[PDB]
Design a binder for this molecule. Structure first.
Ligand SMILES: C[C@H](CO)OC[C@@H](C)OC[C@@H](C)OC[C@@H](C)OC[C@@H](C)OC[C@H](C)OC[C@@H](C)O
Ligand SMILES: O=c1ccn([C@@H]2O[C@H](COP(=O)(O)OP(=O)(O)O)[C@@H](O)[C@H]2O)c(=O)[nH]1
Ligand SMILES: O=c1ccn([C@@H]2O[C@H](COP(=O)(O)OP(=O)(O)O)[C@@H](O)[C@H]2O)c(=O)[nH]1
Lengths: 431, 431
């Protein structure tokens, strides 16, 4: 049996994409070693059905540990953002344990994420072929690489303009982008990416040109399942159809008090039904404006910490998704046909939001010239998309996009499997 | 590799269910020999994605041939109904070739349909274990067995009453004996194409009556990914949502002119949009009332011969299904959330329509005392269910049933695989 060890970056959204890809490979008779830290392995285990455990085994990666930075913090999930440098540094120091794991398990292939340049190096040292897998979409990467080659010409296939709030240590920023691009550039023959040609094909071809490397899509990768759902479903069961927005900002971002107030007042003014997951950093309710939940009454529900996002998005009473536009959340909303109201925050999210808007399956709540979220913009877009449904074009496009994604089967993985087959056959000769 | 030879009955609906079951087994690393007549293998091949051809091989079964009954007639598909006796006899005369196939390929398991009592006997003579797989639902079988054991008591777990048109000779006994032998002769279990949410109490009753375990193998529903669809799609793309009824009576029934006239007149009175599949026997429009199509205009479409039923049922503009209530068409309609307007014709269809009515996912157009279809009932039910959506209870339960069936996965096959694994381990010792 052909074995693959998979090494996601230490974020929950990365674990998620990597696990869906592992399921696809296990269905093609590959045996998977799924490698991450124990806190991440525990968090993602509920998304692996028992029928897979025979062919997808979890393998614990050890990061350096101290009482100030213990194992339960070896993840971006709910991490204090001022510990993010520690997490990156600790991850790079796990390279020798990673080498021990690769020497012991001797997998035939490594698939690794885009935040660990050391990973393909350890694999090369052991004569193990390694392929990069990206859990973002294509648009953001192509937007990042384009000005390196064309610093005086605009990105040529989209009308998207990145708001100045996100355009705003130059060597360190360069070293981070160099590490990121190295992971892609170092990949054996192809890079894998969680996307599909109907949405990003021309960006795929453009990125392949800039990188001088084939880009292989493997998307849509979307997980489909009481973790608290019984109470949530009972409340949703009492709403009209397409009347409710889910509100969430993912696994590794905490919106500021001022940001929560603009969103909260946006929700209130829209008069929509809403389920809103509010989170607090691991060490640390009152993040919300005074009286907001009371005025909301039966229209509002705040879930603390974590919610069954997929089940909520698939409920008949859900008409919209106020999202930070993390890529898994975007793919999920598209697969389930729920139009997105974009409130992006950082990293790839402003690009994802622009791609959502450009494809016509959602809208973006624009920040003001100070870079602040606007309660009026949030309330307006929820009114048009969800409450009054005057944006019939967006709801239709979202429906049409869901029909497209629902039609995709295991053929979406054929190209990856053939490139894996070719790569191993070539390297077996050379070894 | 463990090998399974599958022998459906020579109907297209039996081929279809058996093929879906073959796919489920291929995904569990079984190798499938799919055995039938060449005219049936040709008919079903477009439903088998190319990725399965390495593990699902087609094996031709030869029936006695004559210029008056040549190979292209070796199927119920569009067969003149007066040739049905010749088809059964010809099927039974293939037992020698079937033995030759079994001796040559030496499969580890036979899965056989319920119209070939000779098939388990041939397997038993070669020490090949054999399991019966029923492509109907359970309701009809338990309704057939119940009066054998309780001739003076009502069927205990339903309100359904069979209309006298269908209630109306040791030869009937001999066919019932042959059917029940196929189930009774099955090794340890019987497989059936149903699910507990709809038929669980009937499964338990059937298991007690037969003194054999009944194993549901779930919603088996083929889903495609042009067969005349682009023209139909363009037509459908221009209707309102949920505005259209698909109309079909399956693979092996030609409604009479009197029935066609009642259905056409019901369709016209409802003023619904309709796509209507009209067929004529293999050898051989004229079957419809004068000017029915011209009066229908662009609201009506008649497809001759065959239609992409699943794609049409999944289309956003399809709001109902005027169906003979073949079980594959019922399962498909339920999976796709399309309420059924029942017009059953013979065999198991009246029972399937009753179950559909019982579940509230569809309605039955009642026949007249002498057995005549009622144009007024056809029109009334299409009016209430499709055109003017006043039967929201049916729509809702149709949507709720589709949500249940959409949530099912590969686990629906766990029980069948476990019993197969046990049966092969037991008979391995005994051989
Ligand atoms: C003959 C079988 C032998 O295994 O059992 C006959 C006997 C136990 O009768 C039991 C009862 C169920 O039979 C009722 C009869 C009306 O059905 C016979 C069937 C052939 O039709
Ligand atoms: O309360 C929550 C919040 C998030 N998610 C899931 O967590 C993942 C978040 O990934 P994403 O790419 O959207 O953003 P990130 O967490 O990486 O910032 C997605 O699968 C969401 O469905 C969830 O199940 N419940
Ligand atoms: O024009 C048609 C009519 C039927 N079918 C398919 O043929 C099968 C019919 O099986 P069913 O049990 O409903 O009826 P039967 O043909 O056995 O009487 C189903 O899968 C239908 O989707 C189809 O593809 N096109």
């Amino acid at each position: 049996t052909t074995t693959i060890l998979m090494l996601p970056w230490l974020g929950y959204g990365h674990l998620s994409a990597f696990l869906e890809l592992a399921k696809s490979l296990s269905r093609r008779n590959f045996h998977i070693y799924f490698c991450s830290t124990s806190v991440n392995l525990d968090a993602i285990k509920p998304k692996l059905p028992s029928s897979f455990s025979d062919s997808i085994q979890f393998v614990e990666l050890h990061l350096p540990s101290s009482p100030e930075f213990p194992p339960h913090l070896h993840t971006t999930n709910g991490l204090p953002p001022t510990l993010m440098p520690a997490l990156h540094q600790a991850f790079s120091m796990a390279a020798q344990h990673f080498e021990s794991i690769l020497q012991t398990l001797a997998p035939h292939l490594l698939i690794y994420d885009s935040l660990q340049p050391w990973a393909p190096r350890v694999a090369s040292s052991l004569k193990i072929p390694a392929i990069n897998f990206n859990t973002t979409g294509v648009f953001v990467i192509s937007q990042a690489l384009h000005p390196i080659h064309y610093p005086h010409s605009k990105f040529p296939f989209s009308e998207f303009v990145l708001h100045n709030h996100w355009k705003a240590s130059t060597e360190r920023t360069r070293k981070r982008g160099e590490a990121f691009l190295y992971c892609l550039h170092a990949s054996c023959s192809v890079i894998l990416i969680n996307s599909f040609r109907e949405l990003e094909g021309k960006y795929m071809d453009y990125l392949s040109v800039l990188l001088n490397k084939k880009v292989v899509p493997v998307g849509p990768l979307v997980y489909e399942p009481d973790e608290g759902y019984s109470s949530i479903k009972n409340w949703l069961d009492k709403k009209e159809p397409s009347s409710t927005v889910f509100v969430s900002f993912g696994s590794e971002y905490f919106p500021s008090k001022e940001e929560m107030e603009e969103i909260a007042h946006g929700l209130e003014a829209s008069e929509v039904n809403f389920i809103w997951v509010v989170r607090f950093p691991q060490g640390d309710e009152d993040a919300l404006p005074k009286g907001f939940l009371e005025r909301a009454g039966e229209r509002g529900m705040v879930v603390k910490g974590w919610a069954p996002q997929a089940k909520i998005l698939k409920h008949w009473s859900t008409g919209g998704f106020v999202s930070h536009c993390g890529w898994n959340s975007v793919m999920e909303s598209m697969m389930f046909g729920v139009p997105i109201i974009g409130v992006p925050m950082h990293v790839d999210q402003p690009f994802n939001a622009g791609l959502v808007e450009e494809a016509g399956v959602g809208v973006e709540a624009k920040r003001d010239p100070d870079g602040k979220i606007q309660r009026d913009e949030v309330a307006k877009l929820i009114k048009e998309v969800v409450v009054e449904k005057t944006r019939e074009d967006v709801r239709k496009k979202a429906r049409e996009m869901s029909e497209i994604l629902r039609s995709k089967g295991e053929e979406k993985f054929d190209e990856m499997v053939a490139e894996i087959s070719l790569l191993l056959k070539i390297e077996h000769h050379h070894h």
